[PDB]
Design a protein around this nucleic acid. Sequence first.
RNA 1: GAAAAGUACCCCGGGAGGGGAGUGAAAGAGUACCUGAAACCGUGUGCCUACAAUCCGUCAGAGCCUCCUUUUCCUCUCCGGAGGAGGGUGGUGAUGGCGUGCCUUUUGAAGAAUGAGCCUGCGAGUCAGGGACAUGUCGCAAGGUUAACCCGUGUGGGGUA
RNA 2: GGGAUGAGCUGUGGGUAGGGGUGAAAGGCCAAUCAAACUCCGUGAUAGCUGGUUCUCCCCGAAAUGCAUUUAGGUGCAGC
RNA 3: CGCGGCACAUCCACCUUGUGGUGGGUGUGGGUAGGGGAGCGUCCCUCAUUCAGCGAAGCCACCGGGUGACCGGUGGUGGAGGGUGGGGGAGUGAGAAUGCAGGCAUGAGUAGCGACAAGGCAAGUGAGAACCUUGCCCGCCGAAAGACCAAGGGUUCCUGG
Lengths: 44, 54, 90, 113
Amino acid sequence: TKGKRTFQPNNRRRARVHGFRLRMRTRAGRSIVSSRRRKGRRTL
Amino acid sequence: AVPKRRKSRSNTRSRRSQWKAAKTELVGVTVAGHAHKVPRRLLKAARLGLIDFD
Amino acid sequence: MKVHKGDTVLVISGKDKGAKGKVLQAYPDRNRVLVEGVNRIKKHTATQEAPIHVSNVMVVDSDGKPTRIGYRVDEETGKRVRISKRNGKD
Amino acid sequence: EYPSAVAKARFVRVSPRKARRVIDLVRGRSVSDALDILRWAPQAASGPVAKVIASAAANAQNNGGLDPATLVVATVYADQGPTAKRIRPRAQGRAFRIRRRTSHITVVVESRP
RNA sequence: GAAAAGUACCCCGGGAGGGGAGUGAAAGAGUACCUGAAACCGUGUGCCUACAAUCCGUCAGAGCCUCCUUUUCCUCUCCGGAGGAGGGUGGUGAUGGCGUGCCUUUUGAAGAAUGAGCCUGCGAGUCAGGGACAUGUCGCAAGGUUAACCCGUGUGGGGUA
RNA sequence: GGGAUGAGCUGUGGGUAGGGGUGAAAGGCCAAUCAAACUCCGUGAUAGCUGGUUCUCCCCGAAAUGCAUUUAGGUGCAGC
RNA sequence: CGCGGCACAUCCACCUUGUGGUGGGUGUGGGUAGGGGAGCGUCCCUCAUUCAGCGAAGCCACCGGGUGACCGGUGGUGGAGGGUGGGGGAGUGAGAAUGCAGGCAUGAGUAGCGACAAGGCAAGUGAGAACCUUGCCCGCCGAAAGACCAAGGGUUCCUGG
Ligand SMILES: [Mg+2]
Ligand SMILES: [Mg+2]
Ligand SMILES: [Mg+2]
Ligand SMILES: [Mg+2]
Ligand SMILES: [Mg+2]
Ligand SMILES: [Mg+2]
Ligand SMILES: [Mg+2]
Ligand SMILES: [Mg+2]
Ligand SMILES: [Mg+2]
Ligand SMILES: [Mg+2]
Ligand SMILES: [Mg+2]
Ligand SMILES: [Mg+2]
Ligand SMILES: [Mg+2]
Ligand SMILES: [Mg+2]
Ligand SMILES: [Mg+2]
Ligand SMILES: [Mg+2]
Ligand SMILES: [Mg+2]
Ligand SMILES: [Mg+2]
Ligand SMILES: [Mg+2]
Ligand SMILES: [Mg+2]
Ligand SMILES: [Mg+2]
Ligand SMILES: [Mg+2]
Ligand SMILES: [Mg+2]
Ligand SMILES: [Mg+2]
Ligand SMILES: [Mg+2]
Ligand SMILES: [Mg+2]
Ligand SMILES: [Mg+2]
Ligand SMILES: [Mg+2]
Ligand SMILES: [Mg+2]
Ligand SMILES: [Mg+2]
Ligand SMILES: [Mg+2]
Ligand SMILES: [Mg+2]
Ligand SMILES: [Mg+2]
Ligand SMILES: [Mg+2]
Ligand SMILES: [Mg+2]
Ligand SMILES: [Mg+2]
Ligand SMILES: [Mg+2]
Ligand SMILES: [Mg+2]
Ligand SMILES: [Mg+2]
Ligand SMILES: [Mg+2]
Ligand SMILES: [Mg+2]
Ligand SMILES: [Mg+2]
Ligand SMILES: [Mg+2]
Ligand SMILES: [Mg+2]
Ligand SMILES: [Mg+2]
Ligand SMILES: [Mg+2]
Ligand SMILES: [Mg+2]
Ligand SMILES: [Mg+2]
Ligand SMILES: [Mg+2]
C-alpha cells in the first residue's frame, strides 16, 4: 500500500453505492433527496 | 534561521542600492559608410559584418 | 406613447428647445424618439440624429401651437381617436 | 522652460525594480547616447525601455517639430502597475504565492542645445 | 457619460502602450472607466550626514536655505524692493544636556514574561417584561391606575375585572 | 536486506458500521483523522480558567486583613 | 516664596437673598481598582430657520482657536446634499482578542527552477530562436523509456489559425 491513495475511481461503484436508485430505497435516502431539492442542489 | 525583525527603510535601501548594472564602454565603428557604436570586444566582428545593428 | 411616427413635434426642453421636426422612428420601451434635425451627433466615421426622451417633445395640432393630447370615442367604430387639447381637433 | 515630449508605456510585463536597474544607465544622457547604451546592455528590460525613449524621440520630432540631434532624456522613471497573483505548490501540501509584477514607464525627452 | 457622441485620420511600435488631433460641460470621466483616503513604490529639489555607540524623542543652540518686513544706499523712485544690515515666518539640525517602547498581567516587567509585520474597513453591558429594589422627575391625590377588549384614518375616546 | 509453490501475490464483483465492525492482538485498522469515525442538528453546549472590551475632562479614592467555606488562584459577610 | 491663568470646597456680602448669579477671604486640587459629576464628535427622525450646479458631501493643504474630546476660516479637488437652534432615537467612538476580510511591505532580486540519457552544428522560419522546423552527427532505453488493451479521463485527436 505504498503510494496508493484513497480515491480509486470506478463509475459503476459510484452509482451502486451513492446513486439515485439506492437513495430511493430507504426513508433516510428519500429524506436526503427531498432535502437537496429543498436546498436547491443541481445534483441529487 | 528566520529574520528576527523587519529591516528599517534605511537598512534595506543601503543594501538594495548595490544591485546595479555595470554599463559598458562604446567605441566608434564605420562600416558601409555608417557611424555606429559597439563595445570594444566586438570591434573585429563589427568590421567584418558579423554584428547585426538591428 | 402618445407620439407616433408621422407626427411633427416641437422640442420643449433641451439644447434644441424650440425646433420643429418630425419623428423618424419611435422607441416605446425606452420612451425615446428620433426627430429630424435635433441633437445632431458628430460621430467618427467607421452627422446624424440621436434619440431624445419623449417627455421633451409635444405634438403639433395642425393649427400652430403644440398641445397635450387626449382621446375621444368616435361612437361609430368603437376605437379611440387621438384628439388635441387647446381647441379640440383631429 | 525647454520644449519637451512625453511617452508612456503602461502594463509592461517587466518588474519595476528590474526596469529601474536599466534606466539608471540612461538618465540624463542624450537620446542617441541612450539608445545604444540600451542596445548593448545584456538585461532584458533594456528592450522595452529602449522603445519608449524611441517613441518619445519620435513625438518630439513629428508632433513638436524638434531637432533630433538636440534631444536629451530629461526625465525617466518606472512606476508599478497591477500585480497578478499565482500559486506555486510546495512540500507537504503548502501553497505559496507567486507575483507577476508590471511597470508603467514614463520618458520625458526635452530639446536643449 | 445627459447621450456612446467608446477617440475618424497621422506618427513611433511586431503588438501592447502612447503622442498629436478630435468628441464631451469635464478624458483632472478613455470600457484598466464616479469620487479616489492610507499603507506601500518611484522621480525631482532644500538642508543634514563617511572619528562615531542613537527606545531614535525632548529642551538648550550655531549655521545654511526659502519667503515676507524695518533703516540710507543701485535713488533707473510711482517704480523695481537691486545688494547688504535688523526682525519675522517655513524647512533643516553641527553641537550640549536629559531620556529603559506600547499593551496585558503582576509583590515587582525596558524587560530576555505575554500579544501586536503594516494600513484601511469591520469586531464586545444589548433587548424583552404594568417583573424586583433604590432614586431623579411629572400628573392626580385618601385615593391612584386600568388589563384583555370595544369604537376610530393614528398617537384619540371608552373599558372597574 | 527478507520471502519468493505458498498460512503466496494479485485483478474483478460482493459482504460486515460506530460502544458497532474487523483484528496470526499493535488499542492495530475502519477514506492523510481512532482509548469509541465522519457529517448535520440540540447549540450561541459549558468552562470558579486565559485573552479582548473603543472619545474627554472635573472631584474624591482603596485592598491584598478577619470569619466561614468540597474551601485555599473561587465566593458570602465584615473591614477599608 | 514671588508674579499671572484655571478649577473645586467652604465662609462672608448682596441681586426674586440658593432655582441661582456676582464679589471678597481662607483652604484644597499625584493617583491604579473603583464611585460620583459635567461634556465632545458621528448618524437618523420631528419642529423652526438658513445654505447649496454663482458648486453640497467627502477628500487634500495652509492659517488660526479652545481647559480636553475637538473646532473654525481660506484655498485646491470634486459633483448633490449640508449648517444652526429646541427636542427624540442610537448597529455612536478600537491599538492590542496567536481577532476577521482586503490591499501591501520585510526577508530579497535571496532559496529554488522536480533525478545522474547529453547534446552539437548547418540551413530555415520569424519583430524576436539554447528550446519550433528540416538535414547530418553524437548519446540514452531496448522484459522498456517499444507496441497493444482494461479501469479512469473526456475532445486532450485531425486540419487551419
Ligand atoms: Mg422631460
Ligand atoms: Mg501532494
Ligand atoms: Mg491614439
Ligand atoms: Mg489627447
Ligand atoms: Mg469640443
Ligand atoms: Mg468633473
Ligand atoms: Mg485603477
Ligand atoms: Mg477614477
Ligand atoms: Mg565628521
Ligand atoms: Mg557611553
Ligand atoms: Mg512572578
Ligand atoms: Mg496590582
Ligand atoms: Mg516582549
Ligand atoms: Mg526584547
Ligand atoms: Mg511575535
Ligand atoms: Mg539469504
Ligand atoms: Mg530479492
Ligand atoms: Mg530465495
Ligand atoms: Mg470496537
Ligand atoms: Mg498496551
Ligand atoms: Mg487513517
Ligand atoms: Mg464516548
Ligand atoms: Mg438546549
Ligand atoms: Mg462560553
Ligand atoms: Mg487626593
Ligand atoms: Mg482566597
Ligand atoms: Mg464583599
Ligand atoms: Mg498636590
Ligand atoms: Mg485628582
Ligand atoms: Mg478609574
Ligand atoms: Mg472651480
Ligand atoms: Mg451623510
Ligand atoms: Mg481641520
Ligand atoms: Mg471649503
Ligand atoms: Mg469642499
Ligand atoms: Mg457634518
Ligand atoms: Mg435636530
Ligand atoms: Mg442626543
Ligand atoms: Mg460599533
Ligand atoms: Mg483600525
Ligand atoms: Mg489587528
Ligand atoms: Mg492578512
Ligand atoms: Mg540572505
Ligand atoms: Mg541557486
Ligand atoms: Mg526539469
Ligand atoms: Mg540558425
Ligand atoms: Mg546502451
Ligand atoms: Mg495535436
Ligand atoms: Mg491545433
